[PDB]
Design a protein around this ligand. Structure first.
Ligand SMILES: O=C(N[C@@H](O)C(=O)O)c1ccccc1
Ligand SMILES: [Ca+2]
Ligand SMILES: [Hg+2]
Ligand SMILES: [Hg+2]
Length: 329
């Protein structure tokens, strides 16, 4: 054959019934070791105009925590709910990732905290990072923290401290502050090592890298995991104004962008990139329902991709595929 757009295409898996789930705002997705989908959602709680004040202190405390199960593990085939937890803990759930031991790492924008959770415990968090409901910028505080990444080989814990800070903080396995890097993207053009809302983390296990979705700058920044050296910047006109979430599997970087402003050419979409060259090789969207705020993305080596939306309260399963002739060319 000839013409050379990529033969790789991501399509919604239509026989997955998880799209019919009615959670709250889906803020986080992850895969466990048995390849189940794990979602983190806000139940009846919404991040809205009344949630915070000028100084980033949560305003709906008298309403209490989310009283329903906030973390659900979902079957990859029939989408049945295998387990649930996280009841009466969280206020505005944000990030979720799972380490190699199977612990849930979780982030709360209202509490300004990060939690490590044993999924089989009925005793509560193993570790809590941050000060309850208290925003800050020093070693013991967060300011609307957004994501967590935990390196399998060292145990090092990385937290993107994002919506009101511009840093990535490293912690010990025991939760001691080790180091930190990043600053606000300065006036004129944003420069290497400067974030405007670090919003999502992807580890690259065997290339010693840590990628950050730089939300308000519409770019992805990659750093050496040990020396914090800026490695590379990924930015495309197709992204538009925002990059909400990234996820890595060997060979690929998956990303998800923001909903366009009135006037913008670039639709909301999922992106597949060749990890080496950085180039977009495919662009995709669901058949059922629609993207509004696709908010987190995870991919598996088996070629499965999951995306959760924070405005349409939906999670979708897609599969990566290479066809001799892309469905419909
Ligand atoms: O996009 C926002 N929130 C989402 O990421 C979310 O729902 O988590 C946001 C909007 C206004 C102010 C601050 C944050
Ligand atoms: Ca995640
Ligand atoms: Hg081809
Ligand atoms: Hg967010």
């Amino acid at each position: 054959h000839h013409h050379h757009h990529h033969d790789f295409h991501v399509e919604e898996e239509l026989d997955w019934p998880g799209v019919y789930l009615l959670p709250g705002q889906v803020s986080g997705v992850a895969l466990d070791s048995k390849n189940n989908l794990v979602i983190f959602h806000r139940g009846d709680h919404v991040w809205d105009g009344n949630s915070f004040d000028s100084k980033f202190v949560y305003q709906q405390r008298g309403l209490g925590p989310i009283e329903e199960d906030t973390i659900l593990v979902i079957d990859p085939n029939n989408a049945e709910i295998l387990q649930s937890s996280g009841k009466n803990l969280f206020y505005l759930p944000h990030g979720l990732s799972i380490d190699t031991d199977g612990n849930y790492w979780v982030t709360d924008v209202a509490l300004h905290q990060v939690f490590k959770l044993d999924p089989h415990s009925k005793e509560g968090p193993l570790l809590i990072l941050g000060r309850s409901m208290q925003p800050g910028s020093d070693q013991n505080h967060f300011c609307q923290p957004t994501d967590v990444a935990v390196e399998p080989s060292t145990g090092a814990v990385f937290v993107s401290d994002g919506y009101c800070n511009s840093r990535i903080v490293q912690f010990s396995p025991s939760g001691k502050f080790v180091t930190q890097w990043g600053e606000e993207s300065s006036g004129s053009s944003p420069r290497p090592g400067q974030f405007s809302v670090p919003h999502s983390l992807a580890l690259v296990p065997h290339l010693d890298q840590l990628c950050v979705a730089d939300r308000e700058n519409g770019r992805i920044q990659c750093f050496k995991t040990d020396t914090k050296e800026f490695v590379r910047e990924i930015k495309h006109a197709s992204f538009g104004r925002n990059v909400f979430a990234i996820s890595y599997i060997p060979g690929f970087l998956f990303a998800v962008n923001g909903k366009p402003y009135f006037g913008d050419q670039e639709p909301v979409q999922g992106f597949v990139m060749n990890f080496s060259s950085g180039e977009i090789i495919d662009v995709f969207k669901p058949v059922r329902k629609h993207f509004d705020m696709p908010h987190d993305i995870v991919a598996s080596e088996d070629g499965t991709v999951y995306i959760g939306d924070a405005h349409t309260n939906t999670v979708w399963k897609f599969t990566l595929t290479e066809k001799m002739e892309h469905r419909s060319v």
